[PDB]
Protein backbone atom coordinates (compact mmCIF):
# COMPACT_ATOMS: atom_id res chain seq x y z
CA UNK A 1 0.00 0.00 0.00
CA UNK A 2 3.36 2.54 -0.09
CA UNK A 3 1.97 3.13 -3.72
CA UNK A 4 -1.03 4.73 -2.08
CA UNK A 5 0.30 6.84 0.82
CA UNK A 6 0.17 10.53 -0.33
CA UNK A 7 -1.69 9.72 -3.48
CA UNK A 8 -4.39 12.37 -2.12
CA UNK A 9 -4.44 16.30 -3.48
CA UNK A 10 -6.20 18.92 -1.92
CA UNK A 11 -7.50 20.28 1.61
CA UNK A 12 -11.09 20.58 3.12
CA UNK A 13 -12.13 23.68 0.44
CA UNK A 14 -11.17 22.12 -2.26
CA UNK A 15 -11.76 18.74 -1.86
CA UNK A 16 -9.69 15.51 -1.31
CA UNK A 17 -9.47 14.54 -4.55
CA UNK A 18 -7.55 11.51 -6.26
CA UNK A 19 -5.96 11.58 -9.92
CA UNK A 20 -7.66 9.25 -12.17
CA UNK A 21 -7.61 7.59 -16.08
CA UNK A 22 -10.82 6.89 -17.64
CA UNK A 23 -11.16 5.67 -21.12
CA UNK A 24 -8.62 4.60 -24.19
CA UNK A 25 -6.97 6.20 -24.83
CA UNK A 26 -6.37 7.45 -21.03
CA UNK A 27 -8.37 10.82 -19.82
CA UNK A 28 -7.09 12.49 -16.48
CA UNK A 29 -9.68 13.27 -14.49
CA UNK A 30 -9.60 14.78 -10.50
CA UNK A 31 -11.92 13.19 -8.64
CA UNK A 32 -12.91 13.85 -5.03
CA UNK A 33 -13.17 10.90 -2.33
CA UNK A 34 -16.73 10.63 -1.21
CA UNK A 35 -17.67 8.20 1.14
CA UNK A 36 -21.31 9.76 1.63
CA UNK A 37 -22.42 8.92 -1.96
CA UNK A 38 -22.39 5.82 -4.09
CA UNK A 39 -21.61 6.64 -7.83
CA UNK A 40 -18.92 7.10 -10.12
CA UNK A 41 -19.99 10.50 -11.33
CA UNK A 42 -18.18 12.86 -13.45
CA UNK A 43 -18.34 16.27 -16.00
CA UNK A 44 -19.48 15.18 -19.39
CA UNK A 45 -19.39 18.49 -21.04
CA UNK A 46 -17.43 21.95 -20.29
CA UNK A 47 -18.58 24.19 -16.77
CA UNK A 48 -17.78 27.08 -14.33
CA UNK A 49 -15.51 26.42 -11.62
CA UNK A 50 -14.21 23.40 -13.60
CA UNK A 51 -10.88 22.91 -16.67
CA UNK A 52 -11.57 19.04 -17.68
CA UNK A 53 -14.08 16.77 -18.35
CA UNK A 54 -14.04 13.43 -19.81
CA UNK A 55 -15.35 12.95 -23.40
CA UNK A 56 -17.05 9.99 -23.78
CA UNK A 57 -17.18 10.31 -27.43
CA UNK A 58 -13.12 10.69 -27.23
CA UNK A 59 -12.85 7.11 -25.94
CA UNK A 60 -13.00 3.85 -27.55
CA UNK A 61 -13.73 1.58 -24.92
CA UNK A 62 -16.83 3.47 -23.50
CA UNK A 63 -20.19 2.15 -23.83
CA UNK A 64 -23.45 3.69 -22.92
CA UNK A 65 -26.21 2.04 -21.15
CA UNK A 66 -28.73 4.06 -22.74
CA UNK A 67 -30.47 5.61 -20.07
CA UNK A 68 -30.03 9.04 -17.36
CA UNK A 69 -29.61 9.17 -14.14
CA UNK A 70 -31.18 12.09 -11.56
CA UNK A 71 -30.47 12.65 -8.04
CA UNK A 72 -32.24 15.77 -6.67
CA UNK A 73 -31.03 16.66 -2.73
CA UNK A 74 -31.36 19.42 -0.75
CA UNK A 75 -28.39 22.05 -1.75
CA UNK A 76 -29.57 20.86 -5.53
CA UNK A 77 -29.24 17.96 -8.15
CA UNK A 78 -27.37 16.51 -10.81
CA UNK A 79 -28.40 14.68 -14.29
CA UNK A 80 -25.95 12.49 -16.30
CA UNK A 81 -25.70 9.32 -19.05
CA UNK A 82 -24.79 6.35 -17.28
CA UNK A 83 -22.11 3.99 -19.01
CA UNK A 84 -19.30 1.56 -18.77
CA UNK A 85 -15.79 2.39 -19.17
CA UNK A 86 -12.05 1.06 -18.11
CA UNK A 87 -10.21 3.37 -15.54
CA UNK A 88 -6.78 2.99 -13.92
CA UNK A 89 -5.57 4.68 -10.44
CA UNK A 90 -1.90 5.17 -11.03
CA UNK A 91 -0.87 5.90 -7.40
CA UNK A 92 -2.59 2.48 -6.67
CA UNK A 93 -2.74 0.39 -9.27
CA UNK A 94 -0.97 -1.21 -12.42
CA UNK A 95 -4.17 -2.64 -14.75
CA UNK A 96 -7.19 -1.21 -15.45
CA UNK A 97 -10.63 -2.08 -14.60
CA UNK A 98 -14.54 -1.86 -15.68
CA UNK A 99 -16.48 0.36 -14.32
CA UNK A 100 -20.13 2.16 -14.22
CA UNK A 101 -19.79 6.10 -15.17
CA UNK A 102 -22.41 8.95 -14.18
CA UNK A 103 -21.34 12.02 -16.66
CA UNK A 104 -23.03 14.84 -15.85
CA UNK A 105 -24.26 17.05 -18.19
CA UNK A 106 -26.79 19.19 -15.99
CA UNK A 107 -26.34 20.37 -12.00
CA UNK A 108 -27.20 22.55 -9.49
CA UNK A 109 -25.00 23.63 -6.60
CA UNK A 110 -22.64 20.68 -7.58
CA UNK A 111 -19.49 21.93 -8.92
CA UNK A 112 -19.41 24.77 -6.57
CA UNK A 113 -16.92 27.90 -6.64
CA UNK A 114 -13.24 27.27 -5.91
CA UNK A 115 -12.93 23.29 -6.27
CA UNK A 116 -10.13 21.46 -8.14
CA UNK A 117 -12.19 18.24 -8.94
CA UNK A 118 -14.25 17.19 -12.20
CA UNK A 119 -15.84 14.39 -10.67
CA UNK A 120 -16.70 12.31 -7.01
CA UNK A 121 -16.04 9.17 -6.55
CA UNK A 122 -18.48 7.68 -4.59
CA UNK A 123 -17.28 4.94 -2.21
CA UNK A 124 -20.69 4.11 0.17
CA UNK A 125 -22.21 0.93 -0.45
CA UNK A 126 -24.55 -0.53 -3.37
CA UNK A 127 -28.10 0.92 -1.07
CA UNK A 128 -27.37 4.44 -1.76
CA UNK A 129 -26.64 3.98 -5.95
CA UNK A 130 -28.79 5.87 -8.31
CA UNK A 131 -30.57 5.29 -10.61
CA UNK A 132 -30.64 2.09 -8.26
CA UNK A 133 -28.55 -0.89 -6.35
CA UNK A 134 -27.85 -2.88 -9.43
CA UNK A 135 -25.91 -0.20 -10.67
CA UNK A 136 -22.38 -1.93 -9.80
CA UNK A 137 -20.39 0.96 -7.37
CA UNK A 138 -16.78 1.85 -8.26
CA UNK A 139 -15.26 -0.38 -4.81
CA UNK A 140 -17.78 -3.45 -5.43
CA UNK A 141 -15.95 -3.28 -9.14
CA UNK A 142 -12.62 -3.00 -7.73
CA UNK A 143 -12.68 -5.16 -5.23
CA UNK A 144 -13.78 -8.05 -7.52
CA UNK A 145 -11.67 -7.04 -10.47
CA UNK A 146 -8.21 -6.44 -8.26
CA UNK A 147 -8.63 -9.16 -5.54
CA UNK A 148 -8.12 -6.31 -2.86
CA UNK A 149 -9.90 -7.08 0.34
CA UNK A 150 -13.43 -4.75 1.01
CA UNK A 151 -11.55 -2.40 3.06
CA UNK A 152 -10.17 1.29 2.73
CA UNK A 153 -8.39 3.77 4.62
CA UNK A 154 -8.40 7.49 4.37
CA UNK A 155 -6.05 9.97 6.02
CA UNK A 156 -7.14 13.97 5.37
CA UNK A 157 -3.54 16.13 6.02
CA UNK A 158 -5.05 19.51 5.13
CA UNK A 159 -5.44 20.79 8.78
CA UNK A 160 -1.45 19.57 1.05
CA UNK A 161 -3.03 16.41 0.43
CA UNK A 162 -3.46 12.73 1.84
CA UNK A 163 -4.04 9.35 1.48
CA UNK A 164 -6.48 6.84 -0.05
CA UNK A 165 -5.63 2.97 0.81
CA UNK A 166 -7.73 0.75 -1.53
CA UNK A 167 -7.57 -2.17 -0.45
CA UNK A 168 -6.43 -2.21 3.40
CA UNK A 169 -4.59 0.18 6.69
CA UNK A 170 -1.26 1.22 5.89
CA UNK A 171 0.90 1.07 9.29
CA UNK A 172 2.84 4.13 8.88
CA UNK A 173 -0.56 6.53 8.97
CA UNK A 174 -1.34 6.27 12.18
CA UNK A 175 0.35 5.79 15.73
CA UNK A 176 -1.70 4.35 19.02
CA UNK A 177 -4.26 1.58 18.45
CA UNK A 178 -7.75 1.38 16.31
CA UNK A 179 -10.78 1.61 17.19
CA UNK A 180 -13.54 0.42 15.97
CA UNK A 181 -17.47 1.15 15.96
CA UNK A 182 -20.28 -1.09 14.40
CA UNK A 183 -21.79 0.08 11.18
CA UNK A 184 -25.30 0.32 11.51
CA UNK A 185 -26.61 0.11 8.46
CA UNK A 186 -25.21 -0.36 5.62
CA UNK A 187 -25.63 3.03 2.72
CA UNK A 188 -23.86 5.86 4.50
CA UNK A 189 -21.59 4.50 6.27
CA UNK A 190 -24.04 4.72 9.65
CA UNK A 191 -22.56 4.70 12.92
CA UNK A 192 -23.95 5.17 16.72
CA UNK A 193 -23.33 8.12 19.11
CA UNK A 194 -23.51 8.00 22.16
CA UNK A 195 -22.63 11.41 23.98
CA UNK A 196 -21.16 14.83 22.90
CA UNK A 197 -18.58 16.34 25.70
CA UNK A 198 -17.87 19.56 24.98
CA UNK A 199 -14.90 21.46 27.69
CA UNK A 200 -15.77 18.16 29.90
CA UNK A 201 -19.44 18.42 29.84
CA UNK A 202 -21.55 16.55 28.02
CA UNK A 203 -24.86 17.91 26.79
CA UNK A 204 -27.89 17.13 28.50
CA UNK A 205 -29.65 15.50 25.03
CA UNK A 206 -30.70 12.18 24.59
CA UNK A 207 -29.14 9.88 23.31
CA UNK A 208 -31.56 9.09 19.99
CA UNK A 209 -30.77 13.27 19.43
CA UNK A 210 -27.19 12.53 17.44
CA UNK A 211 -28.93 9.74 15.93
CA UNK A 212 -32.07 10.80 14.24
CA UNK A 213 -32.49 10.17 11.33
CA UNK A 214 -28.78 8.98 10.97
CA UNK A 215 -25.05 9.98 12.13
CA UNK A 216 -22.50 8.94 9.08
CA UNK A 217 -19.26 9.02 8.29
CA UNK A 218 -18.43 11.53 4.68
CA UNK A 219 -15.52 12.68 3.29
CA UNK A 220 -17.64 14.58 0.97
CA UNK A 221 -19.23 16.94 3.11
CA UNK A 222 -16.14 20.04 4.21
CA UNK A 223 -17.99 20.73 8.13
CA UNK A 224 -18.93 19.17 11.20
CA UNK A 225 -22.74 18.69 10.39
CA UNK A 226 -25.04 18.84 13.60
CA UNK A 227 -29.03 18.54 13.86
CA UNK A 228 -30.32 21.94 14.66
CA UNK A 229 -31.13 21.18 18.61
CA UNK A 230 -28.01 19.84 18.34
CA UNK A 231 -25.67 22.28 16.86
CA UNK A 232 -27.51 24.60 19.15
CA UNK A 233 -26.31 22.87 22.55
CA UNK A 234 -22.62 22.59 20.72
CA UNK A 235 -22.75 26.62 20.41
CA UNK A 236 -24.10 27.21 23.94
CA UNK A 237 -21.75 25.31 25.38
CA UNK A 238 -18.70 26.42 23.14
CA UNK A 239 -19.73 30.13 24.15
CA UNK A 240 -20.07 29.14 28.09
CA UNK A 241 -16.81 26.66 28.15
CA UNK A 242 -15.53 30.44 26.19
CA UNK A 243 -15.01 32.79 29.50
CA UNK A 244 -13.97 35.24 26.77
CA UNK A 245 -15.66 38.32 25.42
CA UNK A 246 -18.52 36.51 22.39
CA UNK A 247 -18.42 35.61 18.90
CA UNK A 248 -20.77 37.51 16.90
CA UNK A 249 -23.65 35.20 16.34
CA UNK A 250 -22.67 35.49 12.75
CA UNK A 251 -19.58 33.32 13.43
CA UNK A 252 -21.67 30.66 14.89
CA UNK A 253 -23.95 30.28 11.51
CA UNK A 254 -21.06 30.99 9.03
CA UNK A 255 -22.40 34.44 7.97
CA UNK A 256 -19.06 36.36 10.08
CA UNK A 257 -15.79 35.46 10.21
CA UNK A 258 -13.65 36.06 13.74
CA UNK A 259 -9.98 37.80 13.17
CA UNK A 260 -7.44 38.37 15.58
CA UNK A 261 -3.67 40.14 15.55
CA UNK A 262 -2.09 37.26 13.70
CA UNK A 263 -0.32 36.47 16.43
CA UNK A 264 -2.87 36.30 19.59
CA UNK A 265 -3.86 32.88 17.88
CA UNK A 266 -7.28 32.17 19.35
CA UNK A 267 -6.91 28.11 20.31
CA UNK A 268 -5.53 28.61 23.90
CA UNK A 269 -9.55 29.75 24.87
CA UNK A 270 -11.87 27.15 22.86
CA UNK A 271 -12.69 23.53 24.51
CA UNK A 272 -12.52 20.52 22.99
CA UNK A 273 -15.13 18.45 21.30
CA UNK A 274 -15.42 15.06 22.10
CA UNK A 275 -17.79 12.48 20.32
CA UNK A 276 -18.49 8.52 21.78
CA UNK A 277 -18.96 5.51 19.59
CA UNK A 278 -20.46 2.51 20.48
CA UNK A 279 -17.20 0.21 20.57
CA UNK A 280 -18.02 -3.78 19.28
CA UNK A 281 -18.91 -4.95 22.42
CA UNK A 282 -21.66 -2.66 23.13
CA UNK A 283 -20.74 -2.06 27.40
CA UNK A 284 -17.84 -0.26 26.17
CA UNK A 285 -17.17 3.06 24.20
CA UNK A 286 -14.27 5.13 23.02
CA UNK A 287 -14.34 9.21 22.31
CA UNK A 288 -12.95 10.97 19.19
CA UNK A 289 -11.50 14.49 20.21
CA UNK A 290 -11.44 17.46 18.06
CA UNK A 291 -8.89 20.93 19.57
CA UNK A 292 -10.15 24.26 18.74
CA UNK A 293 -7.54 24.23 15.86
CA UNK A 294 -9.68 21.59 13.35
CA UNK A 295 -13.16 23.37 14.44
CA UNK A 296 -11.80 27.62 14.30
CA UNK A 297 -10.47 27.28 10.66
CA UNK A 298 -8.25 29.76 8.86
CA UNK A 299 -9.70 31.43 6.15
CA UNK A 300 -2.05 40.66 5.06
CA UNK A 301 -2.07 42.07 8.92
CA UNK A 302 -4.95 39.73 10.23
CA UNK A 303 -5.44 35.58 10.19
CA UNK A 304 -9.06 34.87 10.18
CA UNK A 305 -11.20 31.90 11.01
CA UNK A 306 -14.67 30.04 10.49
CA UNK A 307 -16.51 27.84 12.72
CA UNK A 308 -15.81 24.32 11.26
CA UNK A 309 -19.56 23.02 12.47
CA UNK A 310 -22.66 24.01 10.62
CA UNK A 311 -26.53 22.70 11.25
CA UNK A 312 -28.22 19.84 9.63
CA UNK A 313 -31.68 18.78 9.12
CA UNK A 314 -32.26 14.65 8.97
CA UNK A 315 -28.54 13.62 9.94
CA UNK A 316 -25.02 14.46 12.21
CA UNK A 317 -22.57 14.28 9.59
CA UNK A 318 -19.03 13.09 10.59
CA UNK A 319 -17.24 15.61 7.83
CA UNK A 320 -13.80 16.96 6.67
CA UNK A 321 -13.91 19.24 10.51
CA UNK A 322 -13.83 15.63 12.32
CA UNK A 323 -11.58 13.15 9.87
CA UNK A 324 -8.78 15.77 9.00
CA UNK A 325 -8.04 14.70 12.94
CA UNK A 326 -7.81 10.79 12.34
CA UNK A 327 -7.11 7.83 9.81
CA UNK A 328 -10.42 6.66 9.04
CA UNK A 329 -10.91 2.90 8.39
CA UNK A 330 -14.03 1.83 5.96
CA UNK A 331 -13.79 -1.99 7.00
CA UNK A 332 -16.81 -3.30 5.32
CA UNK A 333 -15.69 -6.68 5.15
CA UNK A 334 -16.60 -6.09 9.12
CA UNK A 335 -18.89 -3.99 9.26
CA UNK A 336 -17.39 -1.03 11.16
CA UNK A 337 -15.53 2.07 11.05
CA UNK A 338 -12.41 2.36 12.38
CA UNK A 339 -10.44 5.43 13.74
CA UNK A 340 -7.20 6.65 15.05
CA UNK A 341 -4.95 9.73 16.07
CA UNK A 342 -3.83 11.13 12.57
CA UNK A 343 0.10 11.73 12.80
CA UNK A 344 -0.06 14.46 10.21
CA UNK A 345 -2.67 15.97 12.08
CA UNK A 346 -0.79 18.73 13.83
CA UNK A 347 -0.23 22.56 14.04
CA UNK A 348 2.47 24.19 15.40
CA UNK A 349 3.82 20.72 16.70
CA UNK A 350 0.72 19.98 18.94
CA UNK A 351 -1.65 17.20 18.15
CA UNK A 352 -4.96 18.65 17.15
CA UNK A 353 -7.43 15.51 17.67
CA UNK A 354 -7.23 12.48 20.46
CA UNK A 355 -8.42 9.27 20.97
CA UNK A 356 -8.89 7.60 24.41
CA UNK A 357 -10.78 5.11 25.70
CA UNK A 358 -12.67 2.83 26.42
CA UNK A 359 -15.32 4.02 29.14
CA UNK A 360 -18.52 2.95 29.97
CA UNK A 361 -22.17 2.90 28.66
CA UNK A 362 -24.05 1.58 31.60
CA UNK A 363 -25.69 5.07 32.10
CA UNK A 364 -26.42 5.37 27.65
CA UNK A 365 -29.91 3.39 26.45
CA UNK A 366 -28.84 0.06 24.32
CA UNK A 367 -29.60 1.58 21.36
CA UNK A 368 -29.33 5.13 20.52
CA UNK A 369 -30.65 4.99 16.83
CA UNK A 370 -34.35 5.06 17.01
CA UNK B 1 -33.42 -4.71 -6.95
CA UNK B 2 -33.40 -8.27 -5.70
CA UNK B 3 -30.08 -9.08 -8.27
CA UNK B 4 -30.46 -13.08 -8.15
CA UNK B 5 -27.84 -15.44 -9.34
CA UNK B 6 -27.83 -19.37 -10.16
CA UNK B 7 -24.42 -20.89 -11.71
CA UNK B 8 -23.96 -24.50 -13.67
CA UNK B 9 -22.03 -26.60 -15.23
CA UNK B 10 -18.82 -27.39 -13.45
CA UNK B 11 -17.72 -30.84 -12.99
CA UNK B 12 -14.46 -33.18 -12.54
CA UNK B 13 -12.22 -33.35 -15.84
CA UNK B 14 -8.76 -33.84 -16.64
CA UNK B 15 -5.87 -31.91 -17.67
CA UNK B 16 -6.42 -30.44 -20.95
CA UNK B 17 -9.76 -30.46 -20.64
CA UNK B 18 -13.14 -28.51 -21.15
CA UNK B 19 -15.94 -27.10 -19.42
CA UNK B 20 -18.87 -24.89 -20.16
CA UNK B 21 -20.24 -22.77 -17.18
CA UNK B 22 -23.45 -20.74 -17.31
CA UNK B 23 -25.21 -18.27 -14.71
CA UNK B 24 -29.20 -17.63 -15.02
CA UNK B 25 -30.04 -14.33 -13.56
CA UNK B 26 -33.55 -12.56 -12.17
CA UNK B 27 -34.11 -9.66 -10.00
CA UNK B 28 -32.77 -6.91 -12.23
CA UNK B 29 -32.27 -5.77 -15.93
CA UNK B 30 -29.24 -8.32 -16.54
CA UNK B 31 -28.86 -6.06 -19.78
CA UNK B 32 -27.80 -3.29 -18.29
CA UNK B 33 -25.22 -5.01 -15.52
CA UNK B 34 -21.65 -5.33 -16.01
CA UNK B 35 -20.67 -9.42 -14.82
CA UNK B 36 -17.94 -10.76 -13.67
CA UNK B 37 -16.67 -14.37 -13.05
CA UNK B 38 -14.62 -14.84 -9.93
CA UNK B 39 -13.19 -18.12 -8.63
CA UNK B 40 -11.78 -19.16 -4.54
CA UNK B 41 -10.19 -22.29 -3.76
CA UNK B 42 -9.74 -23.89 -0.25
CA UNK B 43 -7.24 -22.21 1.36
CA UNK B 44 -6.13 -19.69 -1.29
CA UNK B 45 -6.79 -15.84 -2.43
CA UNK B 46 -9.98 -14.60 -3.67
CA UNK B 47 -8.99 -14.28 -7.34
CA UNK B 48 -10.89 -12.47 -10.27
CA UNK B 49 -10.99 -14.44 -13.79
CA UNK B 50 -13.28 -12.08 -16.27
CA UNK B 51 -15.80 -9.25 -16.17
CA UNK B 52 -17.80 -8.53 -19.50
CA UNK B 53 -19.58 -5.31 -19.78
CA UNK B 54 -23.38 -5.07 -20.65
CA UNK B 55 -23.63 -5.23 -24.36
CA UNK B 56 -20.86 -7.66 -24.25
CA UNK B 57 -18.43 -6.07 -26.17
CA UNK B 58 -15.87 -5.01 -23.60
CA UNK B 59 -14.39 -8.36 -22.04
CA UNK B 60 -11.19 -8.45 -19.55
CA UNK B 61 -8.83 -11.35 -18.48
CA UNK B 62 -6.68 -12.00 -15.72
CA UNK B 63 -3.45 -13.18 -17.13
CA UNK B 64 -3.60 -16.66 -15.33
CA UNK B 65 -6.74 -17.86 -17.91
CA UNK B 66 -5.65 -15.28 -20.78
CA UNK B 67 -6.84 -17.60 -24.14
CA UNK B 68 -7.75 -20.86 -22.25
CA UNK B 69 -11.10 -19.06 -21.12
CA UNK B 70 -13.77 -17.12 -22.88
CA UNK B 71 -16.55 -15.29 -21.09
CA UNK B 72 -19.89 -14.75 -23.40
CA UNK B 73 -23.51 -13.61 -22.06
CA UNK B 74 -27.31 -13.85 -23.64
CA UNK B 75 -29.30 -10.74 -22.96
CA UNK B 76 -32.21 -12.20 -24.59
CA UNK B 77 -31.82 -15.10 -21.72
CA UNK B 78 -30.26 -13.33 -18.82
CA UNK B 79 -27.67 -16.05 -18.76
CA UNK B 80 -24.15 -15.14 -18.65
CA UNK B 81 -21.28 -18.15 -19.72
CA UNK B 82 -17.55 -19.19 -19.60
CA UNK B 83 -15.96 -21.59 -22.09
CA UNK B 84 -12.86 -22.83 -20.23
CA UNK B 85 -10.43 -24.87 -22.67
CA UNK B 86 -7.06 -26.16 -21.62
CA UNK B 87 -7.74 -27.07 -18.18
CA UNK B 88 -5.11 -26.93 -15.63
CA UNK B 89 -5.12 -28.39 -11.93
CA UNK B 90 -4.47 -25.17 -10.58
CA UNK B 91 -7.84 -24.04 -12.44
CA UNK B 92 -9.56 -26.09 -9.65
CA UNK B 93 -11.82 -24.00 -7.55
CA UNK B 94 -15.22 -22.67 -6.68
CA UNK B 95 -16.35 -20.50 -9.60
CA UNK B 96 -19.06 -17.91 -9.22
CA UNK B 97 -20.70 -14.96 -11.22
CA UNK B 98 -21.07 -11.58 -9.02
CA UNK B 99 -22.56 -8.27 -9.66
CA UNK B 100 -23.09 -5.52 -7.83
CA UNK B 101 -22.14 -6.80 -4.54
CA UNK B 102 -24.29 -9.93 -4.46
CA UNK B 103 -22.78 -13.06 -6.11
CA UNK B 104 -24.66 -16.86 -6.76
CA UNK B 105 -23.90 -20.05 -4.70
CA UNK B 106 -20.87 -21.08 -7.09
CA UNK B 107 -20.17 -23.83 -9.10
CA UNK B 108 -17.49 -26.96 -8.69
CA UNK B 109 -14.15 -27.33 -11.16
CA UNK B 110 -11.66 -30.16 -10.30
CA UNK B 111 -8.94 -30.68 -12.74
CA UNK B 112 -7.24 -33.78 -11.40
CA UNK B 113 -4.97 -36.18 -12.97
CA UNK B 114 -5.62 -38.75 -9.77
C1 LIG C 1 -22.92 12.49 -6.07
C2 LIG C 1 -22.80 13.29 -4.83
C3 LIG C 1 -22.68 13.95 -3.84
C4 LIG C 1 -22.54 14.79 -2.61
C5 LIG C 1 -21.74 16.10 -2.94
C6 LIG C 1 -20.66 16.45 -2.16
C7 LIG C 1 -19.90 17.55 -2.50
N1 LIG C 1 -18.78 17.87 -1.76
C8 LIG C 1 -17.78 18.82 -1.86
O1 LIG C 1 -17.82 19.67 -2.66
C9 LIG C 1 -16.69 18.74 -0.94
C10 LIG C 1 -15.81 19.80 -0.85
C11 LIG C 1 -14.85 19.77 0.11
C12 LIG C 1 -14.72 18.56 0.93
C13 LIG C 1 -13.67 18.44 1.83
N2 LIG C 1 -12.82 18.32 2.60
C14 LIG C 1 -15.59 17.53 0.73
N3 LIG C 1 -16.56 17.64 -0.12
C15 LIG C 1 -20.23 18.31 -3.64
C16 LIG C 1 -21.36 17.98 -4.39
C17 LIG C 1 -22.07 16.87 -4.09
F1 LIG C 1 -23.11 16.54 -4.82
N4 LIG C 1 -21.64 13.92 -1.69
C18 LIG C 1 -21.85 14.00 -0.35
N5 LIG C 1 -21.18 13.30 0.55
O2 LIG C 1 -22.73 14.84 0.20
C19 LIG C 1 -23.39 15.86 -0.65
C20 LIG C 1 -23.83 15.10 -1.95
C21 LIG C 1 -25.07 15.73 -2.82
C22 LIG C 1 -26.01 14.67 -2.26
F2 LIG C 1 -26.71 14.07 -3.30
F3 LIG C 1 -26.84 14.93 -1.17
C23 LIG C 1 -24.76 13.89 -1.72
Known sequence: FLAMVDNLQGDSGRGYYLEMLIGTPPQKLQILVDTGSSNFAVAGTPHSYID???????????????????????????????????????????????????????????????????????????????????????????????????????????????????????????????????????????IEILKLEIGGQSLNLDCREYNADKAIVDSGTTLLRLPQKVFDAVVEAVARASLIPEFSDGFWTGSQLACWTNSETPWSYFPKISIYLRDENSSRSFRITILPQLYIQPMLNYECYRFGISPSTNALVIGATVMEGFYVIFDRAQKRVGFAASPCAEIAGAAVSEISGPFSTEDVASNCVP | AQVQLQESGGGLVQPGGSLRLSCAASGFTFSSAIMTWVRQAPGKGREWVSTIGSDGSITTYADSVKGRFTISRDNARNTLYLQMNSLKPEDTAVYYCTSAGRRGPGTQVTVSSH
Open chain 1, 52 to 190: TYFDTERSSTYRSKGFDVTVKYTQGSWTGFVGEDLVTIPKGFNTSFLVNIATIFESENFFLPGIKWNGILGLAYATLAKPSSSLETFFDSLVTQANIPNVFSMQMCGANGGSLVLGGIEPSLYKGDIWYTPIKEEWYYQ
